[PDB]
Amino acid sequence: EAFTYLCTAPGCATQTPVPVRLAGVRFESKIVDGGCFAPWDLEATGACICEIPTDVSCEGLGAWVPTAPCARIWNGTQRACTFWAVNAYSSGGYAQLASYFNPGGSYYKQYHPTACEVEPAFGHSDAACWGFPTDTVMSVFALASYVQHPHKTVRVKFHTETRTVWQLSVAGVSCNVTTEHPFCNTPHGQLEVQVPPDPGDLVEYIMNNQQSRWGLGSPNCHGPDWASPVCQRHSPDCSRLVGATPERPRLRLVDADDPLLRTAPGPGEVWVTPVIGSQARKCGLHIRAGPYGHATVEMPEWIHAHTTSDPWHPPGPLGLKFKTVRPVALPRALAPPRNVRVTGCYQCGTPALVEGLAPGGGNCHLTVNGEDVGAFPPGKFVTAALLNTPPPYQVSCGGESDRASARVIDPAAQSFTGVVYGTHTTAVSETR
Amino acid sequence: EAFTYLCTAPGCATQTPVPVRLAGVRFESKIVDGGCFAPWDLEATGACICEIPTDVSCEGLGAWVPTAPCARIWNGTQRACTFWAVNAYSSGGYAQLASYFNPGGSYYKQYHPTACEVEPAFGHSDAACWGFPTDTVMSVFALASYVQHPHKTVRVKFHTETRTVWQLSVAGVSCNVTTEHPFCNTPHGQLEVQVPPDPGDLVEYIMNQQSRWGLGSPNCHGPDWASPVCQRHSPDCSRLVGATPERPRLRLVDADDPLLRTAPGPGEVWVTPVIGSQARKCGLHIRAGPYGHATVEMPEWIHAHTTSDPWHPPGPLGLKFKTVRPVALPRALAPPRNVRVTGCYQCGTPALVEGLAPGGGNCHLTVNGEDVGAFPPGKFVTAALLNTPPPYQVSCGGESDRASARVIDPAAQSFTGVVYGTHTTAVSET
Amino acid sequence: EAFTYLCTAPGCATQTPVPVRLAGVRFESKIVDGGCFAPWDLEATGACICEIPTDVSCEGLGAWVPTAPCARIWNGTQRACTFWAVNAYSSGGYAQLASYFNPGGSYYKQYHPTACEVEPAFGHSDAACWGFPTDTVMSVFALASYVQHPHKTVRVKFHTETRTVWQLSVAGVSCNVTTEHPFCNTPHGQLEVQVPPDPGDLVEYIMNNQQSRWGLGSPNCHGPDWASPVCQRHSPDCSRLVGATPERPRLRLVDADDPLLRTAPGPGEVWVTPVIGSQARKCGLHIRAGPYGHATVEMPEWIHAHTTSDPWHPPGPLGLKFKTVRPVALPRALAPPRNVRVTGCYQCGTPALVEGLAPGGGNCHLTVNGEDVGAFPPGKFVTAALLNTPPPYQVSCGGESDRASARVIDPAAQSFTGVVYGTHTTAVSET
């Protein structure tokens, strides 16, 4: 019986009674792939127009609205757009008189269709539009949505049931120690390694060549990591949005001298202010937007400060308990298992069902694509295992492998299982 | 000293030096009862009406609006309803002219009160209503709320401080090993069981009665995002608490409006009149954006996102056989005196347990059979997470006594430290 | 070898083979300082006015609106205010006729600027305003926001990687056992303590003098602790708000006989009702507000029922394993480490980078302001450590200490790192 402490740093080693060297530190986990995450990025554009446009769209407003921002914002999430008539046509035109701008602008929309809201804004300052001989004309357009910038999108994998792996060389023999498997064979005995507890759940931020950054925790959306993209926009299949979503932005036409400008817009609020033109029949637009969560996320900067290059592990040391004890040699079945069926999902957080027939002549130390799922006595077995690998599944008892039958879906498919995505439609018929 | 690995599957057994059989696998935990959970289920109804109704309510609109959906939706959470006047009376009537439909409809509501919003919709297509000889009349009603379907409601218990229980039989003698209690007695020695770590928190989804299991908090940011736990929370299965969606945004959208090229957002309800096959009648097409961008199918979600049993690591267990025998310590068997229990049970906040431990040794205290620790004779005080409701039977290992209790249930705890409902205030004249 | 169970209560002790006494129970953790937390406290005020005021502000409405509530609510978070004209001037006045109250009140605002919304309310009952000789005049003002009451604000520290510390006295010799360090040296040989698992994450609620209250968990915002201020208003620097925020309150003028009053207002909704006056040209106002989360949080009461005076620990007992085995004597470097640099943050949840040069003579059992960060062989070292102490950092191998160079920020600074706070402004120029 002997005892020694082994430090956890590279190069750490003990020589007596048996040479033990710390080869490295890694980890095991049950992966939960969340798909794509990004910040809620409110973006706004518009124009102050000394005219009553007949086509309220990016192409129809091309003479005033910035081209690239309009197209990008138009394609965003929870789009909101308003067209305000500040001073309409006094005579002539085509559905451009003040009478066509009723609340909601249904009269204008009849002749000039648009996906945007149309509202009267008579009474608001028209000072920004000048240089007209008789009839002063003015309108304001505002457009805002939650835009998905590719550089701000991150792939996130949650690591559950985390086990720190202390890679040891015990008298030249490889031994990977964890809280689950803390024993190593020594030349004529056994080494039991006392290890610190596991670090709990980890967050793997995958940047895109491909690089992984690490968070320690769930994460905690109520602490210093509140601005994590995990706390924001969630797309399980990196295409469709699910769960918590901000409301459509609230667009407001605010005059330059309005006392409201002494305060800041709230989250999702967009305040637009016409700017007096230096040129005749032209005007600028000042836009004030309240970002979601009260701040704009800077992706490379957030990742650099809120993550580490490697997963965290406790400082140690490890307690090396050397014993003269030798484990009892048990006979094991080396033949492959038969009629193995795998059902459920992988990298999803819900254990998959693994069932089959273990062969005779000992316990089958079952592996599913090399993943340890436990040992089973001969005959029928059933287990619930958290799988990290996709199908097809190669099943073995430690010897030759066989192909299992599988009905296993991916994490993105699991995220959409048990739900009917999109618009729910219903019809109310006329009475008989 | 001897060592052997014991697998964790049914039928697993070792024979030397003393036989150890894996009898079963269960778990211990500190229960946190969350009450009732359900998805945020947006439901909408309405009618296209070739008339200007004077009573905007389920009964008042009975001739057009479907009866059962109206009554159910009207009683829902965060109800929203709008009555649009598309084409009003040209003459006569009673507060039915276009002039009564000012924005917000205050003039109409003065003579025809309603809990619904009233708005003008002049300029919208009235083509759906035909067959009028001199005065075409049209109105549209839309009603939406977050409805509670009983089949979608689940009872949820969170399991904290989870301890996997490896039920062993050591030469016929029952031994329940956990990370807290890993020692067993063997005929002539002691068995120390090396066990894997505990699985962390569990989620128990209670159907109807059947229990289904989730592993985790749950994680509302991953594949289990649509869990009812991530949605509507009712601690007492009656009153709603916490995060709630806004009232639905109802919009009258004409069949040819370019807005129909896009999908409604979460909580948005777009209604479109459908031309009648009969004179002075019309239909209504409803497009609703569900909360979270998808409609939850309860039996289907539960089947794919839960297991029949709680998860446990694959093992094996490390059986360390020792010739060591534990030192016999004196135990007090008399019941504890003047025991007081204060706080809550199945709530997540440890309850205060205080009393007097009797003489003759340490009192291995149990509260309704739950182990709360051992105490030396005299005054004791402990903070224990209780899983059982009052009354509390207290024992030191022998006879039991009735403790005095001021313990509330999880639903009562959820409403403790808060004043529920509408906050009313009066501003008096100077 | 010998074995005995040791209970975890005060007064617990074992006599044989070596006397062991339970001296106390404490804990170690990696602190995550969240800053300030408070409930979302919706507060509303207003007035029923038998006049058409020309200044819609707290001072301008001083003759009708309660002074202290107006000033407090005006300075609140996500402020909303509406001025409704129920019955305007029939003649005369200054931008007070019905024609100035178009939807949105732009005509009125042109002459009478206000940060509040202005809306017509003609058609609503004006019965509350009576005793006018010829021209009946009536308006209604409502104001609401999320107010920060100092007594409702709590400082919160999240405790991660929690380790219960069982303080023992092994024959008068102090030994602090944890799941990380369960061994005690004895003259016989060694005492190995079998301990229960750690309790998981803790929540430390700091009141005010200064008192700490304890929660067990993350917390769970979906269970009985749903009303925790942690689940509500978050201010990392106890000044600026971040994350999830309710919408601006939805103010509505609701007549006394409106069927809407048979239902309760939703969260963030404020319904105002004029009350018929006993005095001529005067009226009262009844306010119905739907609190955030469907209930108003009572801070001392919530804390008393949802927290404990001390952090929770399992009941035990501890398994005392007495061995004749003596640990192997390893050489330790006692000289201070050289060129130590510390980069990152402390009490933030992100491990800081610690790098330097370990001296000769054995392994350097490195401490950063007394915090154990591991042992390193002589030479260059690099480690990722969760730090609980602020800079400056005193570094030691177990002997004399040296001053490390540091670029370490506080938890409030970390919360604002990687973000640009406030209003995002953009200008669209003329072509």
Ligand SMILES: *[C@@H]1O[C@H](CO)[C@@H](O)[C@H](O)[C@H]1NC(C)=O
């Ligand atoms: C907007 O979306 C449409 C349809 O997917 C696509 O054709 C167009 O190129 C997109 N524009 C931009 C700027 O992304």
Ligand SMILES: *[C@@H]1O[C@H](CO)[C@@H](O)[C@H](O)[C@H]1NC(C)=O
């Ligand atoms: C330890 O882990 C390494 C890396 O995964 C592997 O190559 C080695 O075979 C493992 N050793 C044992 C004994 O399993």
Ligand SMILES: *[C@@H]1O[C@H](CO)[C@@H](O)[C@H](O)[C@H]1NC(C)=O
């Ligand atoms: C082990 O657990 C079972 C089931 O609860 C019980 O019947 C048995 O008595 C327990 N054994 C011991 C030694 O406590």
Ligand SMILES: *[C@@H]1O[C@H](CO)[C@@H](O)[C@H](O)[C@H]1NC(C)=O
């Ligand atoms: C145990 O902890 C106490 C309190 O922090 C301390 O005074 C004592 O020195 C510690 N004992 C050892 C052996 O570190």
Ligand SMILES: [Ca+2]
């Ligand atoms: Ca008047």
Ligand code: NA
């Ligand atoms: Na004009």
Ligand code: NA
């Ligand atoms: Na008509």
